[PDB]
């Protein structure tokens, strides 16, 4: 009976999106974004913690002047389930007024919290607000919200990796995998 | 006479560390850290915003269970320049007590800020605190502080890219470059 | 020649609003607010740090069920002076949606930051947003904004005390005084 | 039958410490503190939200130069029930190094949170750290901690008022009362 050190791959049912697929797509989106933001320096924002790996790869493949920033938010309880209103833990380091804001996200599902942030930025007089998401789960929507750039449309699979976690782990996987039912059931 | 949109490359005097060099070193360091933390899930933390690109790539090449978190800090004025004490704007999302902390940094120069945080984590009863930095400028130290893992030891260059900025721009370059004198003086 | 320890009163040229006046006005305002909010538990919010002494005394003389909360904000520089847009350092502990918000302030001058907060709460779907200020300098307005409750309308005086500071000192005076010119110039 | 508008007093079993007692004590503590901090300008800190009414009254009865500041913290869960380690939501606006810190609190019960903050300030190189608390429940201690100034020693009563809440309400009472079992049972 061979026993060895636990590896994350042992918890993965299958690879939904490979690292190779991801890099191919990041290269595509970054080129499109560079073209679309040619003239101005936008503020590319990521909401911690999920967006980090994608935002990092995407922006280095986006050949244009831009500024990066980040926000941290937390839930107010069941009221973060109605309008998506969240508690701001860390706001942007610079003002939104007159800026072209690009929100970089790992996945859009219910669309609630991203919807709340987009309109908060429009309230703060952003010149524009657009969203680029690596993954999109359209059947999950609880409010209408269409991302401006989408890497992949995914079905209702329990996904982890490339920013996506299960109990704060797995975010470091270089691919998006489907977690075996055993691990979370 | 022909004009057109500006490109970041025009502002770079030379490439100090190529994207290929960074990737080779990230692979190397990822493997070493995975080996060192194979029997425990450490808390890998990055201090916004410079550490992101490196933290993303490094953790992707570190095949072990681990948790990610982030801190945001700001200067208290000259009392930060003289001692490292910084104002915490976003604290860790989880407790430090009993955890193995791994601080991921882009560059260590004076070492003041990092030293303040290291001893803050020790005050909070961390089990261990280690530091991995992509770049190390040992001649700049104002306090004794040696990184546990170092990608590159750099000389006296004005650098930008791969997280390093000049007036908040250039962090998205996929390499570490030397900025032309004209741009900052 | 006799010297001794310094006393704050030495720095005050004249009492503008005495402790006796403030207390009489707080009693009056607290009774009005209690009547206006008798059938609802409003969320009374103070923006740190100036509003504290007034908010403590006001709410104590307001005999009705209510909840207290506080926000902390900082300036974005020359982008907070022409919009009022400020950086949120500490957001409310509870959601704004559907709540009657009562902002307690020490003084309204330009009305910029307060106007930004009011419309922020309306963006957050507050049921109502009202403002009670101990002092009002209407001649300083940079935006149209009238408080719903005002203790005293003040002229063009350099004031300190009862929350108002000069270099973070004097906030503990139990009255509002005019600072001797010597101290600030 | 006779039904009237709900008043907070209807939820109060009895008044444990009256407004009259509170003011008499604040006057005493304020005079002692002004004497103890005669020569220096201490940084008087309050942890939101409970400390507000007391800090407000106490500091205005403290006739000495001082700076006020505030912190906001949140629990990490069960790990905040061992060392008292908490998540910092709002840190001090100024540095602690070399400052005489005076923590103003409404009540010390387990002593966990305050013990963590006191030693955090000593870690940040405060010149001194002392505590003034309105109420003290010494039998509640889970860690050793004696306040330097204490208004009243209270037994194990479910208290509300003068900053103390029950479901975020009652903080505005101008006295400290014992809540009727009915209300919380
Ligand atoms: Na651009
Ligand atoms: Na591990
Ligand atoms: Na009410
Ligand atoms: Na003093």
JSON list of N, CA, C and O in Angstrom, two decimals, chain D residues 166-185:
[
{"chain": "D", "resi": 166, "resn": "UNK", "atom": "N", "xyz": [-27.23, 46.31, 22.89]},
{"chain": "D", "resi": 166, "resn": "UNK", "atom": "CA", "xyz": [-27.87, 45.01, 22.78]},
{"chain": "D", "resi": 166, "resn": "UNK", "atom": "C", "xyz": [-28.44, 45.10, 21.38]},
{"chain": "D", "resi": 166, "resn": "UNK", "atom": "O", "xyz": [-29.27, 45.95, 21.09]},
{"chain": "D", "resi": 167, "resn": "UNK", "atom": "N", "xyz": [-27.92, 44.27, 20.49]},
{"chain": "D", "resi": 167, "resn": "UNK", "atom": "CA", "xyz": [-28.31, 44.25, 19.08]},
{"chain": "D", "resi": 167, "resn": "UNK", "atom": "C", "xyz": [-28.15, 45.65, 18.44]},
{"chain": "D", "resi": 167, "resn": "UNK", "atom": "O", "xyz": [-28.97, 46.09, 17.64]},
{"chain": "D", "resi": 168, "resn": "UNK", "atom": "N", "xyz": [-27.06, 46.33, 18.81]},
{"chain": "D", "resi": 168, "resn": "UNK", "atom": "CA", "xyz": [-26.67, 47.67, 18.31]},
{"chain": "D", "resi": 168, "resn": "UNK", "atom": "C", "xyz": [-27.52, 48.82, 18.83]},
{"chain": "D", "resi": 168, "resn": "UNK", "atom": "O", "xyz": [-27.25, 49.98, 18.50]},
{"chain": "D", "resi": 169, "resn": "UNK", "atom": "N", "xyz": [-28.50, 48.52, 19.66]},
{"chain": "D", "resi": 169, "resn": "UNK", "atom": "CA", "xyz": [-29.37, 49.53, 20.22]},
{"chain": "D", "resi": 169, "resn": "UNK", "atom": "C", "xyz": [-28.99, 49.83, 21.65]},
{"chain": "D", "resi": 169, "resn": "UNK", "atom": "O", "xyz": [-28.11, 49.19, 22.21]},
{"chain": "D", "resi": 170, "resn": "UNK", "atom": "N", "xyz": [-29.62, 50.86, 22.21]},
{"chain": "D", "resi": 170, "resn": "UNK", "atom": "CA", "xyz": [-29.39, 51.31, 23.59]},
{"chain": "D", "resi": 170, "resn": "UNK", "atom": "C", "xyz": [-28.08, 52.09, 23.86]},
{"chain": "D", "resi": 170, "resn": "UNK", "atom": "O", "xyz": [-27.94, 52.66, 24.96]},
{"chain": "D", "resi": 171, "resn": "UNK", "atom": "N", "xyz": [-27.17, 52.19, 22.90]},
{"chain": "D", "resi": 171, "resn": "UNK", "atom": "CA", "xyz": [-25.90, 52.89, 23.15]},
{"chain": "D", "resi": 171, "resn": "UNK", "atom": "C", "xyz": [-26.12, 54.36, 23.57]},
{"chain": "D", "resi": 171, "resn": "UNK", "atom": "O", "xyz": [-25.31, 54.93, 24.30]},
{"chain": "D", "resi": 172, "resn": "UNK", "atom": "N", "xyz": [-27.22, 54.94, 23.11]},
{"chain": "D", "resi": 172, "resn": "UNK", "atom": "CA", "xyz": [-27.54, 56.32, 23.39]},
{"chain": "D", "resi": 172, "resn": "UNK", "atom": "C", "xyz": [-28.13, 56.62, 24.74]},
{"chain": "D", "resi": 172, "resn": "UNK", "atom": "O", "xyz": [-28.37, 57.80, 25.04]},
{"chain": "D", "resi": 173, "resn": "UNK", "atom": "N", "xyz": [-28.40, 55.62, 25.57]},
{"chain": "D", "resi": 173, "resn": "UNK", "atom": "CA", "xyz": [-28.91, 55.92, 26.91]},
{"chain": "D", "resi": 173, "resn": "UNK", "atom": "C", "xyz": [-27.84, 56.72, 27.67]},
{"chain": "D", "resi": 173, "resn": "UNK", "atom": "O", "xyz": [-26.63, 56.45, 27.54]},
{"chain": "D", "resi": 174, "resn": "UNK", "atom": "N", "xyz": [-28.27, 57.71, 28.45]},
{"chain": "D", "resi": 174, "resn": "UNK", "atom": "CA", "xyz": [-27.31, 58.52, 29.19]},
{"chain": "D", "resi": 174, "resn": "UNK", "atom": "C", "xyz": [-26.90, 57.87, 30.52]},
{"chain": "D", "resi": 174, "resn": "UNK", "atom": "O", "xyz": [-26.21, 58.50, 31.31]},
{"chain": "D", "resi": 175, "resn": "UNK", "atom": "N", "xyz": [-27.37, 56.65, 30.78]},
{"chain": "D", "resi": 175, "resn": "UNK", "atom": "CA", "xyz": [-27.02, 55.92, 32.01]},
{"chain": "D", "resi": 175, "resn": "UNK", "atom": "C", "xyz": [-26.70, 54.49, 31.63]},
{"chain": "D", "resi": 175, "resn": "UNK", "atom": "O", "xyz": [-26.83, 54.11, 30.45]},
{"chain": "D", "resi": 176, "resn": "UNK", "atom": "N", "xyz": [-26.25, 53.71, 32.61]},
{"chain": "D", "resi": 176, "resn": "UNK", "atom": "CA", "xyz": [-25.97, 52.29, 32.41]},
{"chain": "D", "resi": 176, "resn": "UNK", "atom": "C", "xyz": [-27.08, 51.55, 33.14]},
{"chain": "D", "resi": 176, "resn": "UNK", "atom": "O", "xyz": [-27.28, 51.73, 34.34]},
{"chain": "D", "resi": 177, "resn": "UNK", "atom": "N", "xyz": [-27.82, 50.73, 32.41]},
{"chain": "D", "resi": 177, "resn": "UNK", "atom": "CA", "xyz": [-28.92, 49.98, 32.98]},
{"chain": "D", "resi": 177, "resn": "UNK", "atom": "C", "xyz": [-28.78, 48.49, 32.78]},
{"chain": "D", "resi": 177, "resn": "UNK", "atom": "O", "xyz": [-27.92, 48.03, 32.00]},
{"chain": "D", "resi": 178, "resn": "UNK", "atom": "N", "xyz": [-29.59, 47.75, 33.52]},
{"chain": "D", "resi": 178, "resn": "UNK", "atom": "CA", "xyz": [-29.63, 46.31, 33.43]},
{"chain": "D", "resi": 178, "resn": "UNK", "atom": "C", "xyz": [-30.84, 46.03, 32.56]},
{"chain": "D", "resi": 178, "resn": "UNK", "atom": "O", "xyz": [-31.95, 46.53, 32.83]},
{"chain": "D", "resi": 179, "resn": "UNK", "atom": "N", "xyz": [-30.62, 45.22, 31.54]},
{"chain": "D", "resi": 179, "resn": "UNK", "atom": "CA", "xyz": [-31.67, 44.89, 30.59]},
{"chain": "D", "resi": 179, "resn": "UNK", "atom": "C", "xyz": [-32.62, 43.84, 31.19]},
{"chain": "D", "resi": 179, "resn": "UNK", "atom": "O", "xyz": [-32.17, 42.94, 31.91]},
{"chain": "D", "resi": 180, "resn": "UNK", "atom": "N", "xyz": [-33.93, 43.98, 30.97]},
{"chain": "D", "resi": 180, "resn": "UNK", "atom": "CA", "xyz": [-34.87, 42.99, 31.47]},
{"chain": "D", "resi": 180, "resn": "UNK", "atom": "C", "xyz": [-34.58, 41.65, 30.76]},
{"chain": "D", "resi": 180, "resn": "UNK", "atom": "O", "xyz": [-34.37, 41.64, 29.53]},
{"chain": "D", "resi": 181, "resn": "UNK", "atom": "N", "xyz": [-34.56, 40.53, 31.51]},
{"chain": "D", "resi": 181, "resn": "UNK", "atom": "CA", "xyz": [-34.31, 39.18, 30.96]},
{"chain": "D", "resi": 181, "resn": "UNK", "atom": "C", "xyz": [-35.13, 38.94, 29.72]},
{"chain": "D", "resi": 181, "resn": "UNK", "atom": "O", "xyz": [-34.63, 38.39, 28.73]},
{"chain": "D", "resi": 182, "resn": "UNK", "atom": "N", "xyz": [-36.38, 39.38, 29.79]},
{"chain": "D", "resi": 182, "resn": "UNK", "atom": "CA", "xyz": [-37.37, 39.28, 28.72]},
{"chain": "D", "resi": 182, "resn": "UNK", "atom": "C", "xyz": [-36.82, 39.69, 27.35]},
{"chain": "D", "resi": 182, "resn": "UNK", "atom": "O", "xyz": [-37.01, 39.00, 26.35]},
{"chain": "D", "resi": 183, "resn": "UNK", "atom": "N", "xyz": [-36.14, 40.83, 27.34]},
{"chain": "D", "resi": 183, "resn": "UNK", "atom": "CA", "xyz": [-35.59, 41.42, 26.12]},
{"chain": "D", "resi": 183, "resn": "UNK", "atom": "C", "xyz": [-34.53, 40.57, 25.41]},
{"chain": "D", "resi": 183, "resn": "UNK", "atom": "O", "xyz": [-34.54, 40.48, 24.18]},
{"chain": "D", "resi": 184, "resn": "UNK", "atom": "N", "xyz": [-33.65, 39.92, 26.15]},
{"chain": "D", "resi": 184, "resn": "UNK", "atom": "CA", "xyz": [-32.59, 39.13, 25.51]},
{"chain": "D", "resi": 184, "resn": "UNK", "atom": "C", "xyz": [-32.72, 37.62, 25.63]},
{"chain": "D", "resi": 184, "resn": "UNK", "atom": "O", "xyz": [-31.97, 36.89, 24.98]},
{"chain": "D", "resi": 185, "resn": "UNK", "atom": "N", "xyz": [-33.66, 37.15, 26.46]},
{"chain": "D", "resi": 185, "resn": "UNK", "atom": "CA", "xyz": [-33.87, 35.71, 26.66]},
{"chain": "D", "resi": 185, "resn": "UNK", "atom": "C", "xyz": [-34.94, 35.20, 25.71]},
{"chain": "D", "resi": 185, "resn": "UNK", "atom": "O", "xyz": [-36.06, 35.69, 25.73]}
]
